[PDB]
Amino acid sequence: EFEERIVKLKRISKTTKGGRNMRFSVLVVVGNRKGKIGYGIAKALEVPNAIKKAIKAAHNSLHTIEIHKGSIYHEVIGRSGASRVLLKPAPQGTGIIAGGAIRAIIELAGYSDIYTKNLGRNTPINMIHATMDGILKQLSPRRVAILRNKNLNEL
Amino acid sequence: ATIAQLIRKPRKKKKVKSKSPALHYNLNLLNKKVTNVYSPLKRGVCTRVGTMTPKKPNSALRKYAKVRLTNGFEVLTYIPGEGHNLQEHSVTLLRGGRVKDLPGVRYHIVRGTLDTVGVEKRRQQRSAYGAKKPK
Amino acid sequence: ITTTKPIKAHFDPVADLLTKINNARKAKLMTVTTIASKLKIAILEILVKEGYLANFQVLENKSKTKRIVTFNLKYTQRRIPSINGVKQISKPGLRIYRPFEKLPLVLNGLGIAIISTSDGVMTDKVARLKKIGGEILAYVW
Amino acid sequence: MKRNQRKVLIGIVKSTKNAKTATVQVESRFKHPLYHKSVVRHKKYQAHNEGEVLAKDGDKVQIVETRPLSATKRFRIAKIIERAK
RNA sequence: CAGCUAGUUGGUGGGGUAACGGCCUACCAAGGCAAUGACGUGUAGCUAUGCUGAGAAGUAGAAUAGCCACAAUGGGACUG
RNA sequence: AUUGGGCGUAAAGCAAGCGCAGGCGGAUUGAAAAGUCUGGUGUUAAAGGCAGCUGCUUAACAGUUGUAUGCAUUGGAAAC
RNA sequence: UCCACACCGUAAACGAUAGAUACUAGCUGUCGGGGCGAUCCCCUCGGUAGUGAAGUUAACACAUUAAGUAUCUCGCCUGG
RNA sequence: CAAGGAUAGCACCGGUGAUUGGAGUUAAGUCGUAACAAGGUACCCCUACGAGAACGUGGGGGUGGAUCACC
Ligand SMILES: [Mg+2]
Ligand SMILES: [Mg+2]
Ligand SMILES: [Mg+2]
Ligand SMILES: [Mg+2]
Ligand SMILES: [Mg+2]
Ligand SMILES: [Mg+2]
Ligand SMILES: [Mg+2]
Ligand SMILES: [Mg+2]
Ligand SMILES: [Mg+2]
Ligand SMILES: [Mg+2]
Ligand SMILES: [Mg+2]
Ligand SMILES: [Mg+2]
Ligand SMILES: [Mg+2]
Ligand SMILES: [Mg+2]
Ligand SMILES: [Mg+2]
Ligand SMILES: [Mg+2]
Ligand SMILES: [Mg+2]
Ligand SMILES: [Mg+2]
Ligand SMILES: [Mg+2]
Ligand SMILES: [Mg+2]
Ligand SMILES: [Mg+2]
Ligand SMILES: [Mg+2]
Ligand SMILES: [Mg+2]
Ligand SMILES: [Mg+2]
Ligand SMILES: [Mg+2]
Ligand SMILES: [Mg+2]
Ligand SMILES: [Mg+2]
């Protein structure tokens, strides 16, 4: 049940020897709401083929996401170009405090309660890149225990 | 910049200017001083009525009026309606606004509140134009 | 132990060590050396205790007039370090003082915060246990 | 007995060019309201050299408040440490 | 807005004030503040608080409550 | 943009230097304790804010209990 | 336009990149001191260039002479 | 002792003013074509002189310049 949702449908174009070639570009986010989510941007002369190619790319590039108590473990800032997205853990009940591309990414990934803020640009592809970078840079509290020879997150 | 630099010369915030300055000047008329007291809408008296041409794209004849308020400021105000009873000398009641076509105009005339008659022959959005309910 | 190259250090003792550690981490370098000060010695002792470094070793000249500390980072088998980032708080000029009530928690407890309250440098958790705070040197996670 | 204690200020004499006076200067390190950094300030208080204290120029002097002896004079000199200049 | 201040700064005797005090008086001195912002100009009752903001804080000082000042304008004084 | 921004090509490195005051500043020892941390005490009027409860047919509202912040003094800590 | 003596004090006065300090792959030239002793070539310490990974950047590009990791101080910017 | 009155010269601020200078905004005005390509004389910066006007020329400075070219 890999649900998908459309984030942006731009109308890009080039110029030829007389006239303009117009193609639709779609930014699709595919997620199973259990820990797998990817993104795919595709261009085609028509919306259906563009959506098909974007879904194919999103399913080709899937990333693994780990959740702690339905939320993100520690506060992080994802950077990608001029877009910086701040994610912050939330207690169970606040729900998704995200809006737009971040909200799409978080819901399709499976997180329940996240605090988010877009501190930079508002271009959906770069916001998605920053969000994915922030979630991917995350550290589990068992990898750090293995690294520092602590006792499975014990004090 | 630097903590010492900001300690010496702190951050100065950019100023904020109003969009309808002429509505916030009050003349005492006894001591003859003008004070800055904010007022939503103000009464004025027209001096010259006529038409202007919209800036680049639009093409029309839009009804303006050179109205002098209860203070000593004379402003160009757009009459918002189809047909008017302005006779180059009347009392109107201006409110804030900004028509994009005419440069220099930054006020509107409330219709059907004072000497200026309301806009009849209107059943849609009439409460903005001052029209009695058909009933 | 014998050396060949001259050894220099910055005037700021916390950020000198932080710059050395961060550059070594980014460049995959393992062993680095610097001039030894007692603040740096104590801070390296607590880093070794918390398990962010393999070893730190102080040395003195033959005339007992100069001391230098050399330490190695703890890399795993696939050569990726245990340190992920360093950020200094109490920089020169603007010194950061926080009471116990506002003692920070770095990365929801994953990292550590170096606090030099009254008994030398001290980790955030032990500072919370002792219910007393002070100068906050750097964030290491 | 129990007597309420006056406030004290320690400073360094900056100048003395009148009759029975010594314009002393006191420094403080008040924090900045916003950037939270200590700032060195300077204020020139005045006192009187009534006697037995002299306290010529350059003398590090302790100062205790008192009932106003005159306009702009509300302080008197006390123990002097590091006698120099 | 770069100099301002001649009761302005300090000392002696006396007077006056509920009280200390150039508050006033006679004499003797030239000092006092100021680039860490005097002085000048403009504006404003101050505060607890109201509204807003995740926070740091922004903004107004409704009602009410604490304090100050005024009673057409400008001075003086009796009773207490 | 202290928390929380920048200055090659988008607004922004003075044409360059000698530099007083200011800001910052190598290593070790001792003292004091001005900053820093912490304990006791006094105070920060009432109303307002937040939490709990009672009464108005429930609410708005009223009442009631708890609830911080800063300053001063005194007693300790000595890492910066 | 040139010379002497007095001013003016501006330039695309540009590396369009303030100064100081510590750290971070390498390769190819060239200039100066020092070590060996025909040149040539080798090593060390510095100056000035090209190429180039990590790293940074909106991109061009910078890349141990940084526009990289950081600190200190000064100057400057806040739509046309 | 002293509010106020009269006289007098300085200090700061405000309104207005014949006439005059420039500026912005303006669907379809006149004169040229200065700039963007080597924009047809490469451009730009400081400066001096001159001309209806964009601008022209002298002095110095830059590449934020086209072609050129090397096995
Ligand atoms: Mg053709
Ligand atoms: Mg005296
Ligand atoms: Mg006296
Ligand atoms: Mg905000
Ligand atoms: Mg009130
Ligand atoms: Mg009122
Ligand atoms: Mg009256
Ligand atoms: Mg009486
Ligand atoms: Mg910016
Ligand atoms: Mg520029
Ligand atoms: Mg320069
Ligand atoms: Mg310049
Ligand atoms: Mg120098
Ligand atoms: Mg100096
Ligand atoms: Mg030191
Ligand atoms: Mg209270
Ligand atoms: Mg109540
Ligand atoms: Mg210039
Ligand atoms: Mg040059
Ligand atoms: Mg290069
Ligand atoms: Mg402007
Ligand atoms: Mg041309
Ligand atoms: Mg030309
Ligand atoms: Mg002619
Ligand atoms: Mg000519
Ligand atoms: Mg020329
Ligand atoms: Mg000729």
The domain segmentation of chain D, as residue ranges, is 2-84
* Residue keyed to tokens 């737009």: A100
B103 touches strand H (CB under 7 A): yes
The shortest CB-CB distance from A155 to any of C51, C108, C125 is to C125
Closest chain C residue to B5 measured between Cα atoms?
C93
Closest chain A residue to C52 measured between Cα atoms?
A148
Ligand nearest to the CA of residue B14, numbered in listed order: 21
Q: What is the side-by-side order of every strand in the sheet holding A83-89?
A: A76-80, A83-89, A114-118
Q: How many CB atoms lie within 10 A of CB B96?
A: 15
Q: Which residue pairs from B123-132 have beta carbons closer than 8 angstroms and sit at least 24 positions apart in sequence? A: B129/B80, B129/B81
d(CA A10, CA A49): 14
C39 touches strand F (CB under 7 A): yes
Q: Which two tokens stand for residue A69?
A: 């108590």
Phi, psi of A25 (to 5 degrees): -115, 130
d(CA A51, CA B4): 56
Residue C18 alpha carbon to ligand 15 centre in Å: 16
Q: How many CB atoms lie within 10 A of CB C54?
A: 14
Question: How would you class C21 by CB atoms within 10 Å of its CB: exposed for 0-12, middle for 13-18, buried for 19 or more?
Answer: buried
D38 nearest nt, CA–C1': F35
- Whether A contacts B, i.e. 3 or more CB pairs less than 8 A apart, is no
Give the distance from residue D37's alpha carbon to the nearest chain C alpha carbon, in angstroms: 6
Angstrom distances, CA of residue A13 to CA of A1, A44, A122, C101: 34, 11, 21, 58
Kindly list the partner chains of chain D, i.e. chains with 3 or more CB atom pairs below 8 Å.
B, C
